[model samples]
Target: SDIIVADFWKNNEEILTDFDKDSFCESWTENEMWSIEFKVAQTCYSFLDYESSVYFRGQEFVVKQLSHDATLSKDIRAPHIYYTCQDGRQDDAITGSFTLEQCLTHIFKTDNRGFSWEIIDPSNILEKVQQENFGNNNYLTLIDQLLDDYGVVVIPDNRHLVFKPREIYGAKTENFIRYKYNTDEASFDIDTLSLKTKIKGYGKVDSNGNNYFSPITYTSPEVEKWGIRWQEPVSDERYTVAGNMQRRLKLELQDYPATTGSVILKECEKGDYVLFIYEPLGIDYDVQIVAYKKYPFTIKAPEITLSNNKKSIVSIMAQLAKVLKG
Candidate 1:
């Protein structure tokens, strides 16, 4: 039978770790737990008290071929999120302190679901906090700052946070920002990963297809610093469209993490905020995720079934890029 794991972390300290790659490797046991149809009526703490019904299909799904209700609206523009493996490698074994620690955890809750759901093992937030330097007050304080600012902040140049710039958190883009900054462990050797340029320029694809310009650009050390003053505003049709695309993808993961699945969160309010859930599989598995959040893998043991195939699981499931709110 398929195991529907609960989405259980309450705070930053409760969810992350600094364990080595081997430790993260052994952490997939949560994938083995069984799932049940645990539903509840809307209540004071219910995420559904704010928006539509709870629903999800993996993203990476083709626009066509989804069921009638599933393809409810092509006009509907929701957040789009993708899972990116760290180490700048897409599908290799998730390794390194950065990749392993990030991949082993996840949380899913939607205003639609009316509850909160999380699944984690060696279940001890305090233990993780105690065991590793990664989970500390400074890190949580930085996250609290990001959450307070509607998902945007500065690392203060010298300040340190446990997460990297492009680290793909299941629900925020700060990782993306971090990924862009760290060149040694380079994630965005390509333009797609480096959306936040030191240049501040918008993205505009030229015939060479190398450079993308943004609405803003960095002129120099004095001009490219922080705050609103740093940005030198300019307009280009290409930059506008590309800027929108960047925002769409960046916010997609950030929004979905806050909205998808059976658990609930009070932070998101629909109409004003967007919670996107995408299904990244072909028809069969795509339909399966909607019918049941977790189902038994016909070809494998219950401990091994994920919402999609191995590739999609890495590309789609292990991603927070989709979790953003507009």
Candidate 2:
């Protein structure tokens, strides 16, 4: 099916052109993990996500075309070796105190990969969180410890994972779901979503062993309850605030296009500006690309299946009667 024929121009010119629709299925469960399946070309690839340049087999050819787009972009296909400016080689080690990057590399293994993470705290904290019983314990527990110590929120984007501080709501809207389909099997739940109003963080520790505290408070007209409390030890104030201010929303939409309207629900994260945009659609519901200017988070080819807004539900039979002839 991947054959090239002759092409005709708008000004009566002719040229040869070739294009191939390589069958591929991509899975995105976490930022550190990814997998791809190619049925048509009988090729496949999988790897962990890192700062290094990862080259895909069949896709390598695609990245090469971008080299001509810039003057010095000659070696665009060069493999990105994992190395951080603050930390040296990011390669995994067998056993020892783990850096944040190293711990992440170990947790998001190549066999079964699905996780995402964003570091907003200082580099030293990454080494401070090390456990004496590191490898034996559950990685998820380590994640929990990081959240408690650093104050980061973990969000589930479908099967994908997102770890960051509180997000800023970009857009909001109110609407009901209307389908030519009926609401025969529908259910809803209303719970008091918890939020923090005041935070007492560790400001400084004096030489005399007296601990100083810094109090930060947040007030909103919309929030009814302020479930505020003190996160002791204030391991890192920046990370503490980053964790305390977690923001996430789960909702449903009817008659809405997932590509354009999907990001209307999410807020901006600490280190990233998120944008919802359309990307190439294949077997996967969404695809994500990084290193783009302006927006650090990009959700491509999304499919929204549910919403939390109950008032937005409409009768399927009533809507169907309007469109269908009896």
Candidate 3:
């Protein structure tokens, strides 16, 4: 259904292969190493809760439309290529490493950022939102409606649909790392759910008279237009909240809300409702981490090896990209 990119060098006869093909291969491998380092660094920051450093790195790459795709290189059989948290590929099976550009190139349309930035926003607030609604018939139903109405929906299934080939930074909610829905305001707010923090798990208490898993901060404007918040915590009878702070989020449904308090377009039929939800900050059911393991491909390992070797040969080409005025 999607256009597959192949080796144009081998397929296209008109394009000249005269200009340092070996150098291109070398440069390509070097870039791959740079990408791997960048991935590891981001992963480290994610696990460490180092928001500032992560944000800084994010600013360097965040392009608007780049995204990640699962099927992009499935046929290639590379060993090292994988999907990680930064790309919303947190499953243990997607653990192998590869270049950002290559990952992006295969998954998305934009070639500008070349995998410099990826969409990890789904992990924070987005994931929290998804956690709130896990398993209910309405939960998946609303998500389906949102996706159909808004092209992009911030639900668990669509979490993988992020901008790619262009690495983009991830964004967090205004206050706490997690949140839920406060339906009265027709808005999303942080809930006082049974939240688990880095220092302790649920049933643990803190010095501030607040549960280690209670609401701490609040978002400024409600995340209303893009998505909806779930009323329950992930640990309740239905859903199992993620053990890690990992979460899933779909892209916001960026569209106009209809008159009936729905995000559907103005032109939508009277009975139709646009899909959008919001969540509040709470310690209870935050976000859900869709579990998957790393899938291996032998081809990726060779590319990474060669790329690391080539990186030693070049100077600043693989260093972070510099900002320029448009």
Best by lDDT: 2
Full-model lDDT, candidate 1: 0.22
Question: What is the lDDT for 13 in model 1?
Answer: 14
lDDT of 2 by residue, 108-225 (tens): 5542233455554443322233233343335555555544433344544322445543222112323232222323332112122222233333433557755444433333322333
**Ranking of all candidate structures by their lDDT, best first:** 2, 1, 3
Please report, in order, the local distance difference test score of every candidate based on alpha carbons.
0.22, 0.29, 0.21
The model with the greater TM-score, 2 or 3, is: 2
Model 3 CA lDDT for position 96: 22
10 residues in a row with least lDDT, candidate 1: 283-292
Candidates in descending TM-score order: 2, 3, 1
Cα-based lDDT at residue 249, candidate 1: 31
Number of the predicted model whose TM-score against the real structure is largest:
2
The digit string of per-residue lDDT tens for model 3 on 106-152 reads 33332222223343434232221112222222222422322322223
